[PDB]
């Protein structure tokens, strides 16, 4: 198949009323659709309980809710690695300091991973959906 010259890009709804009619509408219509997808994703992650019934066979990992909060509450080096993997710049630093104050040994590799996270983001929280 080749491109259909009479049709607008496939992403848009193929309907005379909904089809974009300008270069600005083209951009705004996609942005509105992306906003809708973002709102749904926010709800899905805000209330995972509602979307935890897995009925798909084979299992689809991508259609499951995402959990972004650290699930290990113990103050330990192994527990700190989780926060670095989750990219919690503030939690990792606060925990790393607490770990250092307690006096437990932090592996150079773990500290290097913390610097990588801190150096890349400049000690600023990565943009999130909403707080």
């Amino acid at each position: 198949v080749n491109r259909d010259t009479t049709a607008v890009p496939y992403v848009f709804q193929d309907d005379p009323y909904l089809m974009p009619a300008s270069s600005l509408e083209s951009r705004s219509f996609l942005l509105a659709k992306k906003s809708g997808e973002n709102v749904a994703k926010f709800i899905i992650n805000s209330y995972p309980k509602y979307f935890q019934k897995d009925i798909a066979e084979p299992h689809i990992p991508c259609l499951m809710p995402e959990y972004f909060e650290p699930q290990i509450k113990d103050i330990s080096e192994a527990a700190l690695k989780e926060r670095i993997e989750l990219r919690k710049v503030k939690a990792s630093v606060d925990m790393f300091d607490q770990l250092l104050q307690a006096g437990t040994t932090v592996s150079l590799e773990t500290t290097n991973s913390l610097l990588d996270l801190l150096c890349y983001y400049g000690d600023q929280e990565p943009s999130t959906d909403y707080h």
Binding site: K34, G36, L63
Partner: protein
């Protein structure tokens, strides 16, 4: 007298669509089915879960697009895919339609764990089959 799904004659001023104008004894004669899946075929399984999904989807779409739907939904299932075909009105702004399409497709895909598509057809006004 039979009552089931019969819009009753009035003074000749009630507009009815083609689906609303046909009583249940026409469901395989003049009108088709609003849902197509395999659950109700001989030797097929999971008819109960397909029905609960259909009932929910029709309520979800009625409240998600308040006042926009111009007729009943057409639910289509092919393999893993779920296709919702809705005839809507041309009153709500297109921006709001695109937001609701992206929102409903995403929210329903995560709820029923399958790729869901929503195909909207706009009509200027409700299509009147006859006046009862």
């Amino acid at each position: 007298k039979n009552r089931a799904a019969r819009v009753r004659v009035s003074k000749g001023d009630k507009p009815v669509t083609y689906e609303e104008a046909h009583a249940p004894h026409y469901i395989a004669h003049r009108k088709g089915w609003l849902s197509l899946h395999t659950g109700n075929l001989d030797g097929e399984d999971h008819a109960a879960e397909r029905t609960v999904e259909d009932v929910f989807l029709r309520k979800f779409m009625w409240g998600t697009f308040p006042g926009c739907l111009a007729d009943q939904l057409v639910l289509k299932r092919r393999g893993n895919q779920l296709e919702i075909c809705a005839v809507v009105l041309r009153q709500l702004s297109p921006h709001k339609y695109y937001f609701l399409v992206g929102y409903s497709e995403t929210l329903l895909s995560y709820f029923y764990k399958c790729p869901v598509r929503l195909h909207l057809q706009t009509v200027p006004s409700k299509v009147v089959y006859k006046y009862l």
